[PDB]
Amino acid sequence: DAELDQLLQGHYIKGYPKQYTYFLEDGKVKVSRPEGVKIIPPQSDRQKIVLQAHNLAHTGREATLLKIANLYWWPNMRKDVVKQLGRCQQCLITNASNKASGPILRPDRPQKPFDKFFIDYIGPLPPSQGYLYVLVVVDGMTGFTWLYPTKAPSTSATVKSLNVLTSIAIPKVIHSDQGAAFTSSTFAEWAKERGIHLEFSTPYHPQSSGKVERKNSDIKRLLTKLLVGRPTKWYDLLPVVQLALNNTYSPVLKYTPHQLLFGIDSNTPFANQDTLDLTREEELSLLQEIRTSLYHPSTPPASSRSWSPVVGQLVQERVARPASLRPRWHKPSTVLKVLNPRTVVILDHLGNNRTVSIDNLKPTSHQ
Amino acid sequence: DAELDQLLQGHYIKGYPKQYTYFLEDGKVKVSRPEGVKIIPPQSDRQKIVLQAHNLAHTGREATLLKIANLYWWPNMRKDVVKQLGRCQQCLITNASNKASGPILRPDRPQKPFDKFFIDYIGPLPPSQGYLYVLVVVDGMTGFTWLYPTKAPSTSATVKSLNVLTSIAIPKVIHSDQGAAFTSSTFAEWAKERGIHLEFSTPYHPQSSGKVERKNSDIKRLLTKLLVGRPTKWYDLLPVVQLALNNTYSPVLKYTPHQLLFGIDSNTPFANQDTLDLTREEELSLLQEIRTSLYHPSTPPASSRSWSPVVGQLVQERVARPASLRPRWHKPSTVLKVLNPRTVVILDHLGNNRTVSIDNLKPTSHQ
Amino acid sequence: DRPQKPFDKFFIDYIGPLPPSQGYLYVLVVVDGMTGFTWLYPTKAPSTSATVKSLNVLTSIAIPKVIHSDQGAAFTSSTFAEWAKERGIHLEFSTPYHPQSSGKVERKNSDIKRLLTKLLVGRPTKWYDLLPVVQLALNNTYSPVLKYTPHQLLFGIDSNTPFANQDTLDLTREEELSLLQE
Amino acid sequence: DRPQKPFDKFFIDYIGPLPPSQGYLYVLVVVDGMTGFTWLYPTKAPSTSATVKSLNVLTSIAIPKVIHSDQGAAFTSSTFAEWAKERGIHLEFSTPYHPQSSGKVERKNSDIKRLLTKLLVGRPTKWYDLLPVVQLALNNTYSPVLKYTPHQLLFGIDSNTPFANQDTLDLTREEELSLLQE
DNA sequence: ATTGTCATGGAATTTCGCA
DNA sequence: TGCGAAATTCCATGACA
DNA sequence: ATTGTCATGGAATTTCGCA
DNA sequence: TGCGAAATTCCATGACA
Numbered sequence A, B: 001d002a003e004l005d006q007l008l009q010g011h012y013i014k015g016y017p018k019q020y021t022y023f024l025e026d027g028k029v030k031v032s033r034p035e036g037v038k039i040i041p042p043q044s045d046r047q048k049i050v051l052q053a054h055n056l057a058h059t060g061r062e063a064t065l066l067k068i069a070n071l072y073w074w075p076n077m078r079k080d081v082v083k084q085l086g087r088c089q090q091c092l093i094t095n096a097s098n099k100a101s102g103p104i105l106r107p108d109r110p111q112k113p114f115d116k117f118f119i120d121y122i123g124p125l126p127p128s129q130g131y132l133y134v135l136v137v138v139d140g141m142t143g144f145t146w147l148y149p150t151k152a153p154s155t156s157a158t159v160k161s162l163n164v165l166t167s168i169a170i171p172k173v174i175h176s177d178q179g180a181a182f183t184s185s186t187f188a189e190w191a192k193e194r195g196i197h198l199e200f201s202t203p204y205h206p207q208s209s210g211k212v213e214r215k216n217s218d219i220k221r222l223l224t225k226l227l228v229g230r231p232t233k234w235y236d237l238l239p240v241v242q243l244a245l246n247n248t249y250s251p252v253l254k255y256t257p258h259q260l261l262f263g264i265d266s267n268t269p270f271a272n273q274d275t276l277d278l279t280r281e282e283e284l285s286l287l288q289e290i291r292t293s294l295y296h297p298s299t300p301p302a303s304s305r306s307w308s309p310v311v312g313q314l315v316q317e318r319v320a321r322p323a324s325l326r327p328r329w330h331k332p333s334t335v336l337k338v339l340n341p342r343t344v345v346i347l348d349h350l351g352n353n354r355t356v357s358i359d360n361l362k363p364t365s366h367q
Numbered sequence C, D: 001d002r003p004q005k006p007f008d009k010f011f012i013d014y015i016g017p018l019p020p021s022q023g024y025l026y027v028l029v030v031v032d033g034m035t036g037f038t039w040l041y042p043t044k045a046p047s048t049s050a051t052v053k054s055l056n057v058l059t060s061i062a063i064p065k066v067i068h069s070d071q072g073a074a075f076t077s078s079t080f081a082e083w084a085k086e087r088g089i090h091l092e093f094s095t096p097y098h099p100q101s102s103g104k105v106e107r108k109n110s111d112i113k114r115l116l117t118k119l120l121v122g123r124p125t126k127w128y129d130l131l132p133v134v135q136l137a138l139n140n141t142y143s144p145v146l147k148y149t150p151h152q153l154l155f156g157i158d159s160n161t162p163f164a165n166q167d168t169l170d171l172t173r174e175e176e177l178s179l180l181q182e
Numbered sequence E, G: 001a002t003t004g005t006c007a008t009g010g011a012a013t014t015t016c017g018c019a
Numbered sequence F, H: 001t002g003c004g005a006a007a008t009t010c011c012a013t014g015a016c017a
């Protein structure tokens, strides 16, 4: 009000260009701008104006400004608009992101077989012999896969299946998603008893189990092909599919998972016989060099508008199962540590520490 | 067999390079190739070999060849491999495509208001006053939107809602997806009685209703924001949201849907007053030029490996609701007519004519 | 003075009581003063509740600066006053027993009453279904003064339902006899 | 002559009948002839049905060129013959009453019978749960002749469960007394 | 406290068979 | 030393609730 | 017989206020 | 005739079962 009073008499105030005629009409300070005559409201009223304009349809920067510009003008209007957008809790938790996640990591392939198992459940499937699910265990180095039909994605069926698997070898690390079968204390004790380290995906990020998920694709695809024009009796096919995929060439590797695991084909059809004149010790020597020379993909180029997490940044976690007409994002939280360019620890909306993938994060807009 | 007999004595046969020693061992014609000694099977046995190798895991080109190459060699092995892949019905209907759809069309914005309505249902939503669905009617030219709460996405609720809407004006064309509410004969008679042409999206292609679907996004987004920390009583908010969105600026157009429809804001907050000194006839003149100068997007660049439909091409329609462990694609069908680079008529798997979007088509591999 | 514009003034009034049609007895008539555009809302009573219920539909499409009406009880109530104040609508009343509006609006309301009468006869209880086609006819009637229909003046375009076949708007000799019996 | 390789020959035989453990009475022993790698499958009978059921699990991981066994009824049946023919497995039998296999395999089967005995005492009905840890021990036992464990020879890597603490494999004086009572 | 993956089939590129 | 063709590699595309 | 769309907020670009 | 800053435009991103 005092700021605008000095403007009417013609005195200069920083932010208000001097080349315009600021006059008074109907008790309101007005300016004759190119777009027309706009009302210059006192500083003390501008916050309420930006709020009334924003709250009509909770519009973003430009759609809110265009409303205000219809009636008002003042220095740096968008600055006051953006200030409100960053304080509007409903917009922060309901709006989508417009910045993509940084480019994916391609973690190093495990050096040896049994260094890391990836496990996951497929299902529910059509009932077959009373069974509904398939426990899928993929060795990370070799791609070699074990298939177990279960009646539930339960810890008890996981333990029963892995006790049979670990008859052959114990893995260093088992990786799974955060499903109930794998996060239970009963499963943790099972793994601790055998010296196995349990490694979990970040929540709601199946890419992290991509090794097994991708194999799930091949399993369902082969099952589908074998079941065409037949009732879906997939129980008796799991052994067939397991053998078939474990002996299937990966065109980019030029090897089957069986070969990466054993260094020699068994008595399967079209068994490779190149190492027939080598001894087993010479064969294993060639196997050790093959395992180390396998193709490894590199991180792809970042998309043009990607974001990478910074310690201290305000970020928002995606709501897991958002109800109808409910926000898709949690309230803002702070990045505590950056484990890698795609994984962070945040100070959760409940106050807890949470390790999340940035694919389930957006950076809070307007800082 | 006779072809291979002349090879053993050293006579040249086209396809078999002369610089190799073709010998006989254990009743099998063999060749000493760089990779090792391979068996050259007679022509009459090669089809069965390619089939046995392919059928292990129904592998594609390279993974099948790598199996055969373990034991056999013959001229142009991949040619025989690809020939089988194009005859394997299970692979054709189960495998994914590796060719993207051609770039999307950006159909011209309707010239006038009421030239084309786009309509669709939102729901089911949380019960509000007994209502579960929202009929959304978007005028194509203006974006101006009418909202009607219904208890079902039914024809009867559609007719009741549109009889109220058409009190203001009758549209030339109503566009909808192929939902039950809109494809019923009862709805067709309703539209024929009023001189309205019913235009339907291709099946299972919500992009075709993108005008309304995109507005559904704004409606749910605003409803969500208004309902934060409240029970989801959205019935009383539909009028509020309808008014709010119809008076919201589109930053790229610089106009609200209300303005594109009426050429002047009503007594809503922050009503634009630029045309206050013009007469209504001068105002409508400016409106007619605004409607014609609106921003129109252009077709984006095609992705590097896109396909475009050709009359006569073998293509496959995506299965609508594929059961578990069942193929995702129908048997091959022929393109009858290319309506536009993204829409075709095909000779359906049932023998009928079907108008489908190419987003629900893949070109049949291996011709 | 600023030229007249749509949404500058809405003229509202009740027509009724009419014969019951699907439970409705009255018609709330809303005419835009500049375009002559007409909205018809069927109500069950000439009450503030019914008026607010029907105007809430209309004011979710466009809000007038001024609503004009007579001193009818539904429009002079404190409830309807609070309703208008909440939407920034100024209420303007005509003098009691001196109903004045506008030549264009006066003639428009004549057309509405005469058009309703013409289709009330022969089916006095089926007018609720006919309100849509009545508004279309009213809003696509050529205006001799402005040389544009209300539709053209409101939307700046021609209409997909031009009404070149004008009703007689008078009762034929057979409709006068079947009306004197009702 | 081609060097010996894994999957060239599987030696199979039944151990039992044992005390019942969770409904199982026999153990089908499968030893790879080259690596000495051992698989143990609990069965309910030394039948062709039980043998096919257990070998179907194993042959979904790796198929041997040859299966060697004695003239036991389960292995000489026409059903088991058809089973082997369908998988391209050649069946090779030792002479009746002249059971011959291989020094490495003979010694391996000795270790299995002695290891089973050592853990049968004190808990003769809880061996079904112990079969996993028995196979691990067997397959990570250092081979004095090849100077590699069966695990190392089959996978070309060291194991995450090395068994440097070898059991006595003989019955202690207290285990001999508690066995003569059973 | 953790991280995408890889079969696929046209296209791009390299290698082969011959001179 | 270079050509046409076959063979191999490349890699975008899509799907693993 | 048909066809994606557009609010969003950082970034890129243009325009403004002043000289 | 050009600078710093504000204002406007651009546009990738994502979601509409």
Ligand SMILES: COC(=O)CNc1c(C(=O)NCc2ccc(F)cc2F)c(=O)n(O)c2nc(OC)ccc12
Residues within 6 Å of the ligand: A120, A121, A177, A178, A179, A180, A204, A205, A206, A207, A210, A213, A214, F016, F017
């Ligand atoms: C974000 O996706 C989700 O909400 C997670 N959905 C699951 C998925 C899932 O979304 N799979 C689809 C999928 C999508 C992208 C991808 F890169 C891999 C993938 F498998 C899953 O595969 N598994 O195995 C799950 N297992 C669970 O254990 C209880 C729980 C959820 C999933």
Ligand SMILES: COC(=O)CNc1c(C(=O)NCc2ccc(F)cc2F)c(=O)n(O)c2nc(OC)ccc12
Residues within 6 Å of the ligand: B120, B121, B177, B178, B179, B180, B204, B205, B206, B207, B210, B213, B214, H016, H017
């Ligand atoms: C391919 O997607 C589908 O299967 C279709 N799903 C619907 C969708 C649907 O998938 N919506 C999501 C969606 C996805 C992409 C897109 F570009 C727009 C869009 F709305 C829909 O919006 N409506 O309105 C439907 N209405 C129906 O009427 C009965 C039936 C289905 C849908």
Ligand SMILES: [Mg+2]
Residues within 6 Å of the ligand: A120, A121, A177, A179
């Ligand atoms: Mg899972």
Ligand SMILES: [Mg+2]
Residues within 6 Å of the ligand: A120, A121, A206, A209, A213, A216
């Ligand atoms: Mg999964």
Ligand SMILES: [Mg+2]
Residues within 6 Å of the ligand: B120, B121, B177, B179
């Ligand atoms: Mg729909």
Ligand SMILES: [Mg+2]
Residues within 6 Å of the ligand: B120, B121, B206, B209, B213, B216
């Ligand atoms: Mg929809």
Ligand SMILES: [Mg+2]
Residues within 6 Å of the ligand: C013, C014, C070, C072
């Ligand atoms: Mg009255």
Ligand SMILES: [Mg+2]
Residues within 6 Å of the ligand: D013, D014, D070, D072
């Ligand atoms: Mg025996």
Ligand SMILES: [Zn+2]
Residues within 6 Å of the ligand: A054, A058, A059, A088, A089, A090, A091, A092, B225
């Ligand atoms: Zn907001």
Ligand SMILES: [Zn+2]
Residues within 6 Å of the ligand: A225, B054, B058, B059, B088, B089, B090, B091, B092
């Ligand atoms: Zn196939």
